[PDB]
Ligand binder design. Structure first.
Ligand SMILES: *[C@@H]1O[C@H](CO)[C@@H](O[C@@H]2O[C@H](CO)[C@@H](O[C@@H]3O[C@H](CO[C@@H]4O[C@H](CO)[C@@H](O)[C@H](O[C@@H]5O[C@H](CO)[C@@H](O)[C@H](O)[C@@H]5O)[C@@H]4O)[C@@H](O)[C@H](O[C@@H]4O[C@H](CO)[C@@H](O)[C@H](O)[C@@H]4O[C@@H]4O[C@H](CO)[C@@H](O)[C@H](O)[C@@H]4O)[C@@H]3O)[C@H](O)[C@H]2NC(C)=O)[C@H](O)[C@H]1NC(C)=O
Ligand SMILES: *[C@@H]1O[C@H](CO)[C@@H](O)[C@H](O)[C@H]1NC(C)=O
Ligand SMILES: *[C@@H]1O[C@H](CO)[C@@H](O)[C@H](O)[C@H]1NC(C)=O
Lengths: 49, 236, 49, 50, 97, 47, 42
């Protein structure tokens, strides 16, 4: 509902603005989840949304 | 085919003969079995009975048991349960899956099983037997016996150890079953562990209040399957 | 070379490829099923190299 | 449903295609097959499949 | 484990069969031998084992058929009166009386 | 897999099928380990 | 030392009916080792 802006983002799929400054480092989140050393044992995936 | 030549649990192989590979036209199936790596085959089971020595045994046979050797079949052991009028442990061995009667070589294990007894009692028959990936367990009329191991051949003769069961006489071992989960452990991952359960039909005497035991891979410590009107455990 | 073959509805014919002079001409043939016709029979494509 | 023990208001599908297929009295023929006699119903739909 | 076949032997000599995971079964036949047992090899073939009798089956196919030892596939039907009744062009009821 | 840890079995069953078919149940096994062929080599570049 | 004597049938599980133990009464070992006369007292 916020994507109604009249200025063109370089990419479609407005979740690109969400997953851009953190998406460089998905592997560290995965490593922290796999060895259960992080958060509530919650892995928030990047391509599920 | 194979570059390693130790003793371990290796599966059989399925062989397909065809006239051409991509355009498969005349298929025919078969089996191929390794001989130098099979665990059970490297030992001598006991004294070999000849022909016409097994023929007089026929009017004494009462029931038939078989094994499977979970990882590779067709190397089964066939055990005889017999009347209490006759004596002896009678086991035949196959290597070709019982396709001909001339190949089932018959042995007898009476000397080996009387060795660890200090006296012959009355006369014994095999009640049940299982073949785990590396061990052979035989519940006979005079108790439970576990082979030492199969991967370390030292004497070319199986060395049996008699399990202990306090308060158990002959009339209990004739009503007792061995339960085992048939699962193949070929490459032997670290988490894979084998279990064996034994179940009796008893009265819960003073000496022992259980009727159901189980044991881990080297079958030495047998612990009861139930801990602290009362139901009976048919199978654990 | 490539050939296409549709068998009868219930029969099971086995095709075969032969060479007049096997001393100076070798081959390898692969028969794979692709598609299925409107009536229900299946087209087979066999490729000879 | 007025039935005793289940007097209740329920919504329910009404399968019209199933009812139309279950409408039984249809033209048929006593066809001769396998040196015997069978009841073969005449095909009314002009096509076999779509 | 090949062909996922399971066979039960029940006193009065009957033999029941199924596949692993299916929710229905069948009756392979009957066998009245005194002492006997059934064995399944690697390819799936079934053998009848008896003292001085290791039988494999009269008719043998390329695959692992599990009904070779028995002669004819038995009739599973009982003795009652069936009243048939049409309900559609291709469906039919049968009532056992 | 889910995370860092066994084995399991996947069973495909044709519930409709008859009991006289040759193949009905299919049982792949999935193991959360590494195969005996999973190694890493280092070519020295000299040969 | 303490000796204990029973009257048994020489069953399968046990072949002795005469045991004894030392001052720590934890290891009860049979009094006789390897038609058979019964021992009344050891
Ligand atoms: C179904 O049937 C197939 C039939 O092939 C079967 O596949 C076979 O599985 C075996 C395992 O059970 C495999 O054996 C393994 O071989 C490894 C070496 O592979 C090498 O490959 C080279 C290129 O292909 C080849 O040149 C080389 O040649 C051989 O070299 C040997 C010395 O390494 C020598 O002895 C031979 O004579 C021959 O010259 C090999 O073929 C081995 O690394 C592997 O593990 C070793 O086992 C030995 C003995 O226990 C041990 O001392 C050694 O330390 C290794 O143990 C561990 O190795 C890993 C690395 O892998 C280390 O990280 C650990 O620390 C340990 O040290 C094993 O022997 C066999 O290769 C394979 N067949 C083929 C053709 O590849 C399937 O297994 C069957 N499956 C089922 C389910 O039944
Ligand atoms: C328990 O004891 C009764 C009589 O004391 C006996 O009839 C019964 O068979 C015993 N139970 C079992 C399982 O043997
Ligand atoms: C040994 O058994 C017999 C009969 O079974 C019995 O008469 C005798 O009393 C038993 N011995 C003892 C010491 O109880």
């Amino acid at each position: 509902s916020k994507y109604d802006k009249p200025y063109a983002d370089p990419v479609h799929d407005p979740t690109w603005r969400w997953w851009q400054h953190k998406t460089k480092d998905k592997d560290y989140f995965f490593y922290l989840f796999s060895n259960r050393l992080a958060a509530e044992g919650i892995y928030i995936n990047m391509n599920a949304y | 085919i194979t570059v390693n030549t130790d003793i371990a649990a290796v599966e059989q192989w399925m062989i397909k003969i065809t006239m051409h590979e991509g355009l498969n036209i005349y298929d025919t199936e078969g089996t191929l079995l390794d001989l130098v790596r099979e665990p059970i085959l490297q030992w001598n089971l006991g004294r070999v009975l000849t022909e016409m020595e097994v023929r007089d045994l026929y009017p004494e046979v009462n029931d038939i048991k078989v094994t499977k050797s979970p990882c590779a079949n067709d190397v089964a052991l066939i055990g005889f349960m017999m009347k209490p009028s006759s004596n002896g442990v009678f086991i035949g061995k196959t290597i070709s899956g019982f396709w001909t009667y001339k190949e089932c070589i018959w042995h007898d294990l009476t000397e080996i099983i009387y060795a660890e007894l200090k006296d012959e009692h009355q006369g014994l028959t095999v009640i049940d037997l299982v073949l785990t990936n590396h061990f052979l367990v035989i519940l006979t009329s005079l108790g439970l016996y576990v082979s030492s191991d199969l991967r370390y051949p030292t004497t070319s003769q199986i060395k049996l150890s008699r399990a202990e069961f306090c308060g158990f006489e002959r009339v209990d071992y004739i009503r007792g079953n061995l339960w085992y989960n048939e699962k193949c452990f070929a490459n032997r991952e670290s988490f894979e562990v084998d279990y064996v359960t034994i179940t009796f039909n008893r009265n819960r005497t003073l000496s022992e209040s259980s009727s159901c035991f189980f044991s881990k891979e080297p079958f030495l410590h047998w612990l009861p399957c139930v801990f602290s009107s009362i139901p009976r455990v048919i199978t654990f | 070379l490539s050939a296409l073959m549709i068998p009868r509805k219930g029969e099971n014919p086995t095709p075969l490829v032969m060479v007049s002079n096997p001393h100076a001409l070798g081959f390898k043939a692969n028969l794979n099923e692709f598609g299925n016709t409107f009536d229900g029979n299946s087209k087979y494509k066999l490729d000879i190299e | 449903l007025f039935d005793v023990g289940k007097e209740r208001l329920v919504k329910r599908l009404l399968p019209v295609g199933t009812l139309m297929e279950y409408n039984l009295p249809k033209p048929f023929t006593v066809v001769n097959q396998g040196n015997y006699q069978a009841i073969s119903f005449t095909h009314t739909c002009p096509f076999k499949e779509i | 484990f090949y062909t996922s076949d399971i066979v039960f032997i029940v006193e009065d000599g009957r033999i029941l069969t199924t596949k692993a995971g299916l929710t229905t079964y069948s009756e392979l036949g009957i066998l009245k031998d005194a002492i006997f047992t059934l064995y399944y090899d690697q390819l799936g073939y079934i053998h009848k084992l008896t003292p001085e009798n290791f039988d494999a089956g009269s008719k043998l196919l390329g695959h692992g058929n599990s009904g070779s030892i028995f002669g004819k596939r038995p009739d599973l039907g009982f003795e009652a009166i069936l009243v048939p009744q049409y309900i559609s062009t291709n469906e039919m009821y049968f009532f056992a009386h | 897999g889910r995370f860092f840890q066994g084995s399991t079995s996947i069973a495909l069953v044709l519930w409709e099928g008859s009991s006289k078919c040759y193949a009905i149940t299919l049982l792949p096994t999935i193991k959360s380990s590494c195969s005996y062929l999973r190694t890493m080599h280092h070519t020295p570049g000299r040969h």
